[PDB]
Ligand binder design. Sequence first.
Ligand SMILES: *[C@@H]1O[C@H](CO)[C@@H](O[C@@H]2O[C@H](CO)[C@@H](O)[C@H](O)[C@H]2NC(C)=O)[C@H](O)[C@H]1NC(C)=O
Ligand SMILES: *[C@@H]1O[C@H](CO)[C@@H](O[C@@H]2O[C@H](CO)[C@@H](O)[C@H](O)[C@H]2NC(C)=O)[C@H](O)[C@H]1NC(C)=O
Ligand SMILES: *[C@@H]1O[C@H](CO)[C@@H](O[C@@H]2O[C@H](CO)[C@@H](O)[C@H](O)[C@H]2NC(C)=O)[C@H](O)[C@H]1NC(C)=O
Ligand SMILES: *[C@@H]1O[C@H](CO)[C@@H](O)[C@H](O)[C@H]1NC(C)=O
Ligand SMILES: *[C@@H]1O[C@H](CO)[C@@H](O)[C@H](O)[C@H]1NC(C)=O
Ligand SMILES: *[C@@H]1O[C@H](CO)[C@@H](O)[C@H](O)[C@H]1NC(C)=O
Ligand SMILES: *[C@@H]1O[C@H](CO)[C@@H](O)[C@H](O)[C@H]1NC(C)=O
Ligand SMILES: *[C@@H]1O[C@H](CO)[C@@H](O)[C@H](O)[C@H]1NC(C)=O
Lengths: 48, 95, 464, 48, 49, 49
Amino acid sequence: LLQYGSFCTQLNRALTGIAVEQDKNTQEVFAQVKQIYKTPPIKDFGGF
Amino acid sequence: QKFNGLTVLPPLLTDEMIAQYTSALLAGTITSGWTFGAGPALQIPFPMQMAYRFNGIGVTQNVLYENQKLIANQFNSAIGKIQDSLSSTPSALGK
Amino acid sequence: TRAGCLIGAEHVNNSYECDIPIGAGICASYQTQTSQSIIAYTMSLGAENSVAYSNNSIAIPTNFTISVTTEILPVSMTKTSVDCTMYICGDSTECSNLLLQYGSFCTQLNRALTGIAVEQDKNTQEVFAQVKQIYKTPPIKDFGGFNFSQILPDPSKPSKRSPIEDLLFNKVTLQKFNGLTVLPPLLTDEMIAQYTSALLAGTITSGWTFGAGPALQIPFPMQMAYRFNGIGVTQNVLYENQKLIANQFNSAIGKIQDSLSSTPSALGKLQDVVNQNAQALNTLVKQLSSNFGAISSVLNDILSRLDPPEAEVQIDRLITGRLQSLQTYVTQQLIRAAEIRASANLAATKMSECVLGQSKRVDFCGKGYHLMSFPQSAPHGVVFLHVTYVPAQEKNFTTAPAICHDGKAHFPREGVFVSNGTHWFVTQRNFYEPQIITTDNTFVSGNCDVVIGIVNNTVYDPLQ
Amino acid sequence: ITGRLQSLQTYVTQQLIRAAEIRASANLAATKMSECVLGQSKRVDFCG
Amino acid sequence: TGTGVLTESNKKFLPFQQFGRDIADTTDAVRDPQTLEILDITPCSFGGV
Amino acid sequence: KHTPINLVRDLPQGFSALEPLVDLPIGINITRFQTLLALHRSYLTPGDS
Ligand SMILES: *[C@@H]1O[C@H](CO)[C@@H](O[C@@H]2O[C@H](CO)[C@@H](O)[C@H](O)[C@H]2NC(C)=O)[C@H](O)[C@H]1NC(C)=O
Ligand SMILES: *[C@@H]1O[C@H](CO)[C@@H](O[C@@H]2O[C@H](CO)[C@@H](O)[C@H](O)[C@H]2NC(C)=O)[C@H](O)[C@H]1NC(C)=O
Ligand SMILES: *[C@@H]1O[C@H](CO)[C@@H](O[C@@H]2O[C@H](CO)[C@@H](O)[C@H](O)[C@H]2NC(C)=O)[C@H](O)[C@H]1NC(C)=O
Ligand SMILES: *[C@@H]1O[C@H](CO)[C@@H](O)[C@H](O)[C@H]1NC(C)=O
Ligand SMILES: *[C@@H]1O[C@H](CO)[C@@H](O)[C@H](O)[C@H]1NC(C)=O
Ligand SMILES: *[C@@H]1O[C@H](CO)[C@@H](O)[C@H](O)[C@H]1NC(C)=O
Ligand SMILES: *[C@@H]1O[C@H](CO)[C@@H](O)[C@H](O)[C@H]1NC(C)=O
Ligand SMILES: *[C@@H]1O[C@H](CO)[C@@H](O)[C@H](O)[C@H]1NC(C)=O
């Protein structure tokens, strides 16, 4: 296998890039609030 | 699947953490309208917030106030139908 | 852990912000303050804050802040090109004769790479060439207190680039091989800087009008007053607070150059394209040293001592290996070109809708209500300076959605009703400005006995 | 070696393309969360 | 064997190396026989048309 | 590699790269070795050597 050069470093690199980006996708979709908001104990939403 | 060199890495955000994110987003929406996306979250009575969103389509607020009971009933029913729809139609999560 | 057995880091009960991700919610970092060792912990998602929800209280800001954020988008990458015949079969007719027997395999690769190279110029043209004329700023800078010198070009420099984009070119940093050549872009950096100068001058001197039709000069305080009127703040806000707003805008602009010069990894999105192209090219070069089974990897040495009737198999092995490597490179570049084209389309959209207009799309041209945006060219990309309106300080006010008068129910034409606790005022929604409630800022509908949660007050009719 | 290596390359290429598609969908999801959740969109048939 | 332009060089070959090679399996400089001199190899020009 | 050293007793820390002297075509098997020292004569008892 060594005689084929870096065919495998390339594939590991590409799959690592995909895997790393899969976390960025979720971070960008969901991590849009800097602080976690909480709902009040009493639910007086005027009928909703 | 994962026996001969194939391995699956865990995602960075656990489902409890993503659910906490969506709880934060939904709580911010309910209690503060859109204000928390731009700056500090500003508490606002929810009927009043819905009134201004109605005003954001060209229906005067007096509409929502004169028929708030009806609108809230209808909204509760429409949310309830989503549960039954997802529970009864297959291939709904096909994507 | 849920990601595996981690050895070397102490587990800490308390949570911090995430620094080096592990997986399953655990991150690690080097503390240096408490621990001069490596700690691992469960992430915190951010600070907890309950919001003061109640059925009768509003929070309306009493101040604002103007903030300038920066956004970096790739647009193009280097237009590389490689020739089969030299790359695979350098200066050897004996191997080219048997490369010909593979048909069109790498007229096809040349076609693909030429397509990418031609598309890069289209990316740059679509992002920047949005103005039919080159606009220029007047010699006298009477902008009502707004200092733009940090983004307008400086005539004293050998290259007409503004200080900020000069800093960008000084912060991002970018040989002769066999068959690999790099084609120069069609638009030189001077020309791109001239485009962004045209865009900036048109913006400053004409608002958005120059995006729709002929550029119509308007005084800049008046233009900014309109953009304030765009996000729901009456122009008197800007006019009564113009000196403060101009000082604040100048300070925010000044902070940008310092931030870019002092916080590294800010231009990582642009450094990544050059890093990835360099890495792909380095790998493509290093593949020339591989045997693939050959008695020798260098071509002339196997040719020079082995008679063709059996040196042909030896050459064929090398041919197939190198051709496959080149094919892999071309495919990777096609996918990366698709990604860069997506980013260039986003950059063109952002120029149109943030530079040439004022956008109502939330969080599209930065956090906060969008005021206006400034393009700055960067090597192989564009930087956007997004000017936004952000509320600053609020007070809690009691509310009610209506007022009774002699049995009649009044609703706000614009804004909300608020009170100190003794007297009731109408005010606009993003800036505390009370006014006495009059028949001329509210309107009538129905009667008191229908709406829920209404308060009695007197409303003044100016006629009596 | 040749056969398995080329099979792995095919897999990685198709994963790259599928990852690009998922990235486009994730960018659309981030845009939708911004413009529909964090705001109110005047843009027809984008949020329903 | 190979083709290129041959130029004087200031690369101090140590007494034991006889030919240097690039990051690819191609020579970059050589030592001449009969005179023992260091000689730089630069590929002679080419380009697209 | 021959280096003038000032450190007190042991190997220094500074990185240094050895370069070849010779490549002898000996072609023998080597499995053991021993260094050759140079010893003076301080004195001579008649028969000890
Ligand atoms: C509005 O915003 C600015 C900044 O938050 C405030 O401006 C300051 O005003 C005081 C009194 O005029 C000055 O002494 C300060 O020097 C100003 N700041 C700066 C940086 O120059 C203003 O007070 C704010 N209004 C409110 C209600 O917060
Ligand atoms: C326009 O912007 C810049 C930065 O805010 C100002 O440039 C300074 O000009 C003075 C006088 O020429 C120089 O002494 C300074 O060294 C400049 N700053 C720097 C960082 O070099 C310019 O004065 C601004 N104009 C206004 C009205 O504020
Ligand atoms: C807005 O309303 C609420 C309630 O009147 C206030 O919320 C409090 O905020 C402080 C500081 O963040 C917290 O320590 C308290 O715990 C909060 N109250 C509760 C019940 O949790 C908020 O300060 C109000 N703003 C003003 C100007 O009064
Ligand atoms: C973490 O909390 C548990 C709970 O009692 C305790 O046993 C443990 O010692 C704590 N560890 C640290 C590092 O504080
Ligand atoms: C609220 O406004 C009224 C109307 O002028 C004023 O009399 C009162 O003092 C204000 N409240 C406070 C706390 O100052
Ligand atoms: C708000 O809630 C309180 C409960 O403390 C209730 O008395 C009041 O009627 C409510 N107001 C409205 C407008 O529903
Ligand atoms: C408002 O006025 C009506 C009749 O004028 C009265 O019935 C009601 O109690 C008043 N509201 C308050 C809070 O006193
Ligand atoms: C070859 O001849 C030249 C001519 O002077 C001489 O310098 C050189 O030493 C000769 N080659 C060898 C290996 O001695």
